[PDB]
Amino acid sequence: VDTCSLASPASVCRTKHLHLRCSVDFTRRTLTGTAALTVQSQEDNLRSLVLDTKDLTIEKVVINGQEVKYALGERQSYKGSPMEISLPIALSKNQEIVIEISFETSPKSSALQWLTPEQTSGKEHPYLFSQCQAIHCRAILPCQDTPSVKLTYTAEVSVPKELVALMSAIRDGETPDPEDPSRKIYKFIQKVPIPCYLIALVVGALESRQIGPRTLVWSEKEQVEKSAYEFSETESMLKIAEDLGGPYVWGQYDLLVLPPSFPYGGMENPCLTFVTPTLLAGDKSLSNVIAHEISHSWTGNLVTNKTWDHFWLNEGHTVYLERHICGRLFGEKFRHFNALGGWGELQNSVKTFGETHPFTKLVVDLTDIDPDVAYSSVPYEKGFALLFYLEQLLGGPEIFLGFLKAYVEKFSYKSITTDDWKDFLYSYFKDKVDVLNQVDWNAWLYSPGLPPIKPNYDMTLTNACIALSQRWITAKEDDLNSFNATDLKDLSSHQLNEFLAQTLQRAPLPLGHIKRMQEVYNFNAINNSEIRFRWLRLCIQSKWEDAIPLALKMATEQGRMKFTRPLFKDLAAFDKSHDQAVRTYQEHKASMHPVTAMLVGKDLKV
Ligand SMILES: Nc1ncccc1OCc1ccccc1
Ligand SMILES: [Yb+3]
Numbered sequence: 001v002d003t004c005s006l007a008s009p010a011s012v013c014r015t016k017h018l019h020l021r022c023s024v025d026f027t028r029r030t031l032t033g034t035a036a037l038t039v040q041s042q043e044d045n046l047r048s049l050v051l052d053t054k055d056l057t058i059e060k061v062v063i064n065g066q067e068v069k070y071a072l073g074e075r076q077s078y079k080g081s082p083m084e085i086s087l088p089i090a091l092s093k094n095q096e097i098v099i100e101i102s103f104e105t106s107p108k109s110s111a112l113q114w115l116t117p118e119q120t121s122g123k124e125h126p127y128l129f130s131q132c133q134a135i136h137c138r139a140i141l142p143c144q145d146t147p148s149v150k151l152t153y154t155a156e157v158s159v160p161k162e163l164v165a166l167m168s169a170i171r172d173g174e175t176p177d178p179e180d181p182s183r184k185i186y187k188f189i190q191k192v193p194i195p196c197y198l199i200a201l202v203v204g205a206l207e208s209r210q211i212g213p214r215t216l217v218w219s220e221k222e223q224v225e226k227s228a229y230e231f232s233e234t235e236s237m238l239k240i241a242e243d244l245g246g247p248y249v250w251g252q253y254d255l256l257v258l259p260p261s262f263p264y265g266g267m268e269n270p271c272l273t274f275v276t277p278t279l280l281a282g283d284k285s286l287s288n289v290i291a292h293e294i295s296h297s298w299t300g301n302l303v304t305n306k307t308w309d310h311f312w313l314n315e316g317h318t319v320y321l322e323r324h325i326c327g328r329l330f331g332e333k334f335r336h337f338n339a340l341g342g343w344g345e346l347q348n349s350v351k352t353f354g355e356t357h358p359f360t361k362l363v364v365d366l367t368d369i370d371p372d373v374a375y376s377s378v379p380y381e382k383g384f385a386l387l388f389y390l391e392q393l394l395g396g397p398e399i400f401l402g403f404l405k406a407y408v409e410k411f412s413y414k415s416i417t418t419d420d421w422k423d424f425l426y427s428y429f430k431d432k433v434d435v436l437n438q439v440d441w442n443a444w445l446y447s448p449g450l451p452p453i454k455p456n457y458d459m460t461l462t463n464a465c466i467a468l469s470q471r472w473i474t475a476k477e478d479d480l481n482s483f484n485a486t487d488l489k490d491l492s493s494h495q496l497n498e499f500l501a502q503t504l505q506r507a508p509l510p511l512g513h514i515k516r517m518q519e520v521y522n523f524n525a526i527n528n529s530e531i532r533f534r535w536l537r538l539c540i541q542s543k544w545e546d547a548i549p550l551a552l553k554m555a556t557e558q559g560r561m562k563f564t565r566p567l568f569k570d571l572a573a574f575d576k577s578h579d580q581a582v583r584t585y586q587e588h589k590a591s592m593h594p595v596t597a598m599l600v601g602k603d604l605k606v
């Protein structure tokens with residue numbers, strides 16, 4: 001049972017196809033049109049069904065060319081309102097019908113952000129983008145909003161003619177809108193069955209540049225050239241992903257670089273990955289996020305978690321493939337360096353939540369929990385830790401990558417549970433069952449806190465980061481003079497970040513140490529968002545008032561939750577910046593992404 005969905009379950013009826021016909025109304029901040037759902041009964045004598053909705057206005061529901069009865073139920077908080085439809089004729093098992101729903105979205109849709117022209121790069125045109133994961137699709141259109149159901153889709157989207165529409169689908173042409181010559185209709189086809197959380201839309205002043213045989217980069221013109229360079233490894237990473245995972249089935253692999261308020265590093269929308277502009281470091285150093293999004297083309301998009309309780313299946317396998325792609329590109333010592341970094345990130349997560357907290361379990365129970373509230377590094381890093389440990393238990397990366405390919409193959413176009421994964425693991429490694437039987441499954445899958453066993457990690461690239469961090473932590477005032485710009489001489493940007501992550505784990509440091517770091521290392525000058533993020537965190541946590549405006553600026557000039565949430569949190573916890581932090585949030589709140597606005601609000605207890 002999917003405890004995040006109010007719709008009829010897959011055992012009752014299945015959506016097979018969505019045809020979406022809509023217009024994007026920027027003056028009203030609404031999407032208006034029709035969702036025609038092709039629905040297959042899984043039951044005998046089916047007379048009604050329920051769909052998820054959230055903040056939708058339903059005009060009418062039509063089956064066989066006649067309006068039918070429906071009802072919207074009481075709102076259930078973040079789940080929205082169940083929509084029961086009365087079918088005009090009882091269906092037998094496997095019978096399919098088309099249900100056409102006339103709807104309009106609300107300006108407050110939790111799936112959508114609408115930006116004024118001034119919130120964009122060009123300053124001339126407004127911009128819309130969606131983000132449906134986990135359960136925000138109901139906020140765009142009525143649907144069985146559960147990843148246990150996979151469907152194909154087609155769409156025609158009417159937009160102001162000077163603007164461009166894109167979706168998580170193959171572009172299927174454009175014409176002027178016969179009903180309004182100030183408009184264009186963009187058309188789309190997604191013929192690979194997908195969970196509805198993968199439905200995506202952007203409308204804006206978009207341009208494109210080709211960067212590979214099957215990849216265009218899209219953004220506002222101001223960002224095109226930089227994006228093309230930053231993401232040029234994309235094809236090389238695809239070929240590696242295909243070798244590890246099997247054929248890329250989705251046709252194109254385009255990238256869209258969003259405006260700065262996009263809430264995540266990336267979103268694996270099929271045919272069109274969405275990424276944050278915080279990746280634009282200028283040197284391709286944040287490309288693991290591309291490797292990650294590519295990897296989802298197999299783990300997540302082909303093999304899908306059945307409910308959000310098993311999100312780790314999506315994230316853990318993706319991070320595992322991610323790290324392999326980067327290891328292939330940059331060497332096994334680097335994969336290990338990043339693997340160990342992730343364990344670091346997990347200690348952070350477990351420390352923040354508390355070692356007994358329910359969100360630190362690998363498999364969570366989302367009954368009455370908002371997924372956006374439960375969301376964290378845990379499913380990513382505890383999932384990865386599990387796989388890396390199993391990798392080391394069963395004979396190394398070559399062997400376990402055999403399993404990953406078999407696993408993807410076995411479960412393509414399907415939605416699965418942790419038990420499905422574990423069943424197949426045991427079947428695949430039948431001759432290694434005794435060894436599999438040594439794993440403390442109950443602790444790994446169901447217990448809170450750090451895993452019962454830490455994997456083995458090569459230390460090569462990590463040592464210098466630990467060594468420098470230890471020098472700073474153990475230093476007294478008369479040692480500060482010994483620190484010097486040349487300390488960083490042989491460290492890559494990755495290592496600079498790990499050094500800062502190491503140090504941040506022991507924060508606060510004395511204020512004088514942190515001032516000295518700025519003096520000798522000039523971290524204030526680094527634009528790499530991962531580094532700047534951790535450095536500003538260390539500064540605020542060490543009570544440096546100078547850093548207050550820098551932290552406020554980064555928190556608000558971009559909206560990647562990864563960065564924005566802990567920066568506001570740090571600023572709220574520093575007494576000198578507490579008032580300004582609350583004030584700043586309150587001022588930006590209306591113009592933020594709705595999910596980000598919601599979470600920063602809870603975070604700040606405002
Ligand atoms: N939030 C979650 N926490 C633990 C397991 C699964 C989860 O899924 C919810 C989710 C996924 C993606 C985006 C937002 C929320
Ligand atoms: Yb001393």
Ligand SMILES: [Zn+2]
Pocket residue numbers: 292296314315318
């Ligand atoms: Zn992911």
